[PDB]
């Protein structure tokens, strides 16, 4: 028995990064962040080694509607690549449906991220205008909510965003960032709180989260249906979240080291 | 098949007797929140129900001496209910012995106090006596601060395991009308989601001060290896994504409040 669990999970700052001197380093050792610290604590308390592996495709995880084949990290635990998934991963239905979910050790919403100065504070406020674009992350549980939602105003942002052109879309939450800070308040972008809070906290200190959250939901630790790690990464998951280890490494890579004062 | 026996509490705004509940029978004398969501988990899962105010009025807690549980939590364990549908905590010790699907709703402990208290934290509260402060019994509140390590939970802890006259109450509207009696002499320690419902209501005397002291959320709840379980799980995750949860929280919260805003 005993045998290595393969942990699938994705470089987005600040839950999993490269270090400084990585290349002289190696296996767990060279990633650095709050999942990395939040991996090391699972194995910990549920008495499993471990190995820490980056999607291959970078992504997070969409069902590809004509092959019907997932990609992302979801992937990974579908076909058997990864037998636990630690990361930012969203907790919705679609996946729900293939694959298990621990309770939530992250919370948050779908929210706007503006350069700063941008004449917009809210959802409704994109709808209505047209002189600034906005679109969200490809693969995502953000492009779902708006493909999905049967709410008259997010089908309307639907209907706009995936028949915009060039593209709203980015392939990566940098991709989305560095394009709002290049578009001179052209551009606003659609990402998850807990990311666009994360930016707002970082040189230039730029950008910045208006209005209120679209949603309410959370991060959980992922693992193949009917698996036997499930039960016990629960039970982890709640006692560092009773304990406020989970507080601690919110405020440790979020706020402790901010760089915008 | 058979008629799902539901266990609840009398707990505004999650569920209140309407005001003609005298001419009223079955789950119809009952209005709120809760009573909302029942409808809508019964009808997704295709299951009739009967709405059954718990017996003992707690939520759920473990003598330790006999290991006996008490409130929805024992209802559950002792085969008397087939379902919990309340603002019910999403615990370990709860995990240990029923099943939670995932949260529909997010919370934290709070502070409530009579409006004009000097207090602002609760920092302020551990470091000094002439306001004395309690939590509800039974619950999950109480736990935490009995099991609390962080300097300040431990010291607020010492403090009401011991004060006389008890420091504790058996209802939330007892906490809450000692607090409006008392002259700003006694503070309470609830969920922020009552806190805030309180806030909203005539007389309008009380206030939600500081931040939360953690981070969680009630759960639906189940016995141990219930067939209900996964149909639940899957219904909270779509009302959640429809928007329909975001819907009932402003419809009994703030659309109907009376300390105008
Ligand atoms: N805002 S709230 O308190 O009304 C609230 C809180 C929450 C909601 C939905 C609403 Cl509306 N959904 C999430 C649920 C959706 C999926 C992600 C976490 C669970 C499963 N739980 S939650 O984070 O506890
Ligand atoms: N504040 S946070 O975003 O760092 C955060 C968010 C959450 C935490 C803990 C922290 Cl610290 N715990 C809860 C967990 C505790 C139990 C109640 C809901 C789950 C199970 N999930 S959560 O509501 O998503
Ligand atoms: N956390 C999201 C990805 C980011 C986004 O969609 O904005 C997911 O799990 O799909
Ligand atoms: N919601 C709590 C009861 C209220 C409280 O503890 O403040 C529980 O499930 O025990
Ligand atoms: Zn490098
Ligand atoms: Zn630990
Ligand atoms: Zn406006
Ligand atoms: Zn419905
Ligand atoms: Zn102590």
Not at 161 to 186: D, Q
Request: charged share 25%; hydrophobic share 35%; glycine share 10%.
């Amino acid at each position: 028995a005993n045998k290595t669990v393969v942990v699938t999970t994705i470089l987005e700052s600040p839950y999993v990064m490269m270090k400084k001197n990585h290349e002289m380093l190696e296996g767990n050792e060279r990633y650095e962040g709050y999942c990395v610290d939040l991996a090391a604590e699972i194995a910990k308390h549920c008495g499993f080694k471990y190995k820490l592996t980056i999607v291959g495709d970078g992504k997070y995880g969409a069902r590809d509607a004509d092959t019907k084949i997932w990609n992302g990290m979801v992937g990974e635990l579908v076909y058997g690549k990864a037998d636990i998934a630690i990361a930012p991963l969203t907790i919705t239905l679609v996946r729900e449906e293939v694959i298990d979910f621990s309770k939530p050790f992250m919370s948050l919403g779908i929210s706007i991220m503006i350069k700063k100065g941008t004449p917009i504070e809210s959802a409704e406020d994109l709808s209505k205008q047209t002189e600034i674009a906005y679109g969200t992350l490809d693969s995502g549980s953000t492009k779902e909510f708006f493909r999905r939602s049967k709410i008259a105003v997010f089908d309307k942002m639907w209907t706009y965003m995936r028949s915009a052109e060039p593209s709203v879309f980015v392939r990566t939450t940098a991709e989305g960032v560095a394009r709002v800070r290049k578009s001179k308040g052209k551009y606003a972008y659609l990402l998850e709180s807990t990311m666009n809070e994360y930016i707002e906290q970082r040189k230039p200190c730029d950008t910045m989260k208006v209005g209120g959250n679209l949603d309410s939901k959370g991060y959980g630790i992922a693992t193949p249906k009917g698996s036997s790690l499930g039960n016990a990464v629960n039970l982890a998951v709640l006692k560092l979240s009773e304990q406020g280890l989970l507080d601690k490494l919110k405020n440790k890579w979020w706020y402790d080291k901010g760089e915008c004062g």
